[PDB]
Paper text:
GDP-mannose is a nucleotide sugar metabolite that serves as the substrate for glycosyltransferase enzymes that build the fungal cell wall. Nucleotide sugar transporters operate via a strict antiport mechanism, moving nucleotide sugars into the Golgi in exchange for the free nucleotide monophosphate, which is released back into the cytoplasm. Here, we present the cryo-EM structures of the GDP-mannose transporter, Vrg4, from the pathogenic fungus Candida albicans, in complex with nanobodies, in both the Golgi- and cytoplasm-facing conformations. NSTs consist of 10 TM helices that are arranged as two inverted topology repeats of five TMs, such that TMs 1–5 can be superimposed on TMs 6–10 via a 180° rotation in the plane of the membrane.
We identified four nanobodies that exhibited the ability to block the uptake of 3H GMP into liposomes containing CaVrg4, with two nanobodies, NB3 and NB4, showing full inhibition of transport function. Nevertheless, we determined the structure of Vrg4 in complex with NB3 at 3.0 Å. The CDR3 loop of NB3 forms an extended beta-hairpin which extends 23 Å into the GDP-mannose binding cavity. The loop region of the CDR3 hairpin interacts with regions within the binding site that are important for GDP-mannose and GMP recognition. Specifically, Glu104 in the CDR3 loop forms a hydrogen bond with Tyr311 on TM9, which plays an important role in recognising the ribose group in GDP-mannose and is essential for transport activity in S. cerevisiae Vrg423,24. Sitting next to Glu104 on the CDR3 loop is Trp105, which is located close to the conserved (F/Y)YNN motif on TM7, responsible for guanine recognition within the NST family. Interestingly, Trp105 adopts two rotamer positions, with one rotamer engaging the guanine pocket and the other packing against Ile134 on TM3. Both rotamers would aid in favourable interactions to secure the CDR3 hairpin in place. However, NB3 makes several additional interactions with backbone carbonyl groups in the loop between Tyr76-Phe87; this region of the C.albicans protein shows a high level of sequence diversity across Vrg4 sequences and hence, while the CDR3 hairpin interacts with highly conserved regions of the transporters, it is the CDR1 and CDR2 regions that drive specificity in this nanobody.
Author numbering:
A (entry chain A): 48 to 193, 203 to 362
B (entry chain B): 0 to 121
The structure:
């Protein structure tokens, strides 16, 4: 059964939304009092947690993946460099821009990945599929509507994230095909190589002064900080496997569209389990986003039969 | 992105009282923790209190049972009621606000600091 599920399109999609829901729940509802402004060092800790998680499973003879290779780490380096490139540019994008404006631009990259898969991987973008891309941007625009230099750097660091996010999936999906990598080989290399880069970025681009260190690691609460630093990285194990799983089987476009649809369950949860407003500009954002997913799904059915 | 303005500091006799305030501004939906710090002259920052959206309050032993941090979601303000102020409580009190945002590879945190209100007890 481990093989039929491995080459399953719907299952990789469902497991990706579950792992994204689980990771967002942990970092937003389970860890609500957590404060940590050393971003790259905490993300480097996450990659350490995923490395020891699957490295111990393989050492227990449960799972299995390829041995580390010098000539194959040198060929995965561009993908690991791009993965940290999205991390750095998005952190710098959110220091001047908000989350609603970040999602507007992130839903404008699916139109760029969809048209990059056509050029590089061959194919076509149908009109039904295109109209679903504009219906995810519409839902973002509706949701959003409900210093001059600073806002120039907001869109500069946001267009660079658009290019790094699009290049990441297109280059990565190509490289899982000349290497015949499985979902554990991709997870192993995506994390092993990203540890040194994220640690080096945390050295130069983050504050390691005596006052910021004691503000991030208080001496009177060390078990709480270490525990929250590991629960924050144990929830990313599922999304690290299911991101590479989804990209391999379905597409870079489908993986990106599913990622955009992964933020609608969170929005609906706020409107029911929390106090979030139920105004027209927040209900019609969820309904329009659902129509975008249901139009993309039928669009691929027609494309499958065309 | 997020701006904090503090008001309430001043000179109070020993054993007196003081209430500090800290109004947030900007994007106030991603803020999860907001607290108070003090920097005695010649020393580094110390924690005075901490509150989160959910009312979980963290204090310091030296001020436990005296200071009371509270929040007001109507105007996004945090107060700090400082009773029985001994002279060792003189410092510059600063506000904090943590912005946490979650995306497809992990969370991100941004700390915003207020302006600082000088509190002198004598």
């Amino acid at each position: 059964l481990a093989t039929r599920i491995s080459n399953s399109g719907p299952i990789s999609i469902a497991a990706y939304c579950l792992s994204s829901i689980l990771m967002t729940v942990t970092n937003k509802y389970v860890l609500s009092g957590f404060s940590f402004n050393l971003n790259f060092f905490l993300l480097a800790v996450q990659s350490i947690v995923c490395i020891v998680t699957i490295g111990s499973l393989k050492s227990l003879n449960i799972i299995t993946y390829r041995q580390f290779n010098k000539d194959e780490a040198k060929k995965w380096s561009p993908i690991a460099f791009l993965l940290v490139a999205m991390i750095y540019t998005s952190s710098k994008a959110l220091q001047y821009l908000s989350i609603p404006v970040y999602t507007i631009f992130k839903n404008l990259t699916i139109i760029l990945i969809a048209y990059g898969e056509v050029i590089w991987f061959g194919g076509k973008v149908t009109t039904m599929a295109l109209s679903s891309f504009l219906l995810m941007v519409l839902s973002s625009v509706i949701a959003y509507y409900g210093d001059a230099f600073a806002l120039y750097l907001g869109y500069f660091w946001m267009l660079t994230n658009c290019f790094a996010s699009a290049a990441f999936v297109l280059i990565m999906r190509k490289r899982i095909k000349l290497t015949n990598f499985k979902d554990f080989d991709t997870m192993y290399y995506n994390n092993l190589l990203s540890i040194p880069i994220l640690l080096i970025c945390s050295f130069i681009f983050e504050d390691w002064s005596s006052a910021n260190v004691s503000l991030n690691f208080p001496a009177d609460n060390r078990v709480t900080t270490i525990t929250a630093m590991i629960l924050s990285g144990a929830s990313s194990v599922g999304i690290s496997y299911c991101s590479a799983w989804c990209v391999r089987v379905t597409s870079s476009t489908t993986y990106s569209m599913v990622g955009a649809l992964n933020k609608l369950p969170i929005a609906l949860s706020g409107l029911i389990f929390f106090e979030a407003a139920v105004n027209f500009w927040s209900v019609s954002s969820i309904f329009v986003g659902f129509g975008a997913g249901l139009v993309y799904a039928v669009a691929k059915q027609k494309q499958q039969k065309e | 992105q997020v701006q904090l303005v503090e008001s309430g500091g001043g000179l109070v006799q020993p054993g007196g009282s003081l209430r500090l305030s800290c109004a947030a501004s900007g994007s106030i939906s991603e803020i999860n923790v907001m607290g108070w710090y003090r920097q005695a002259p010649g020393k580094q920052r110390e924690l005075v209190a901490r509150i989160t959206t959910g009312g979980s309050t963290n204090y310091a032993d030296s001020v436990k049972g005296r200071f009371t941090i509270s929040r007001d979601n109507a105007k996004n303000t945090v107060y700090l009621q400082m009773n029985s102020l001994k002279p060792e409580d003189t410092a510059v009190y600063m506000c904090n606000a943590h912005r946490r945002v979650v995306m497809e590879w992990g969370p991100l945190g941004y700390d915003y600091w207020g302006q600082g209100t000088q509190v002198t007890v004598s």
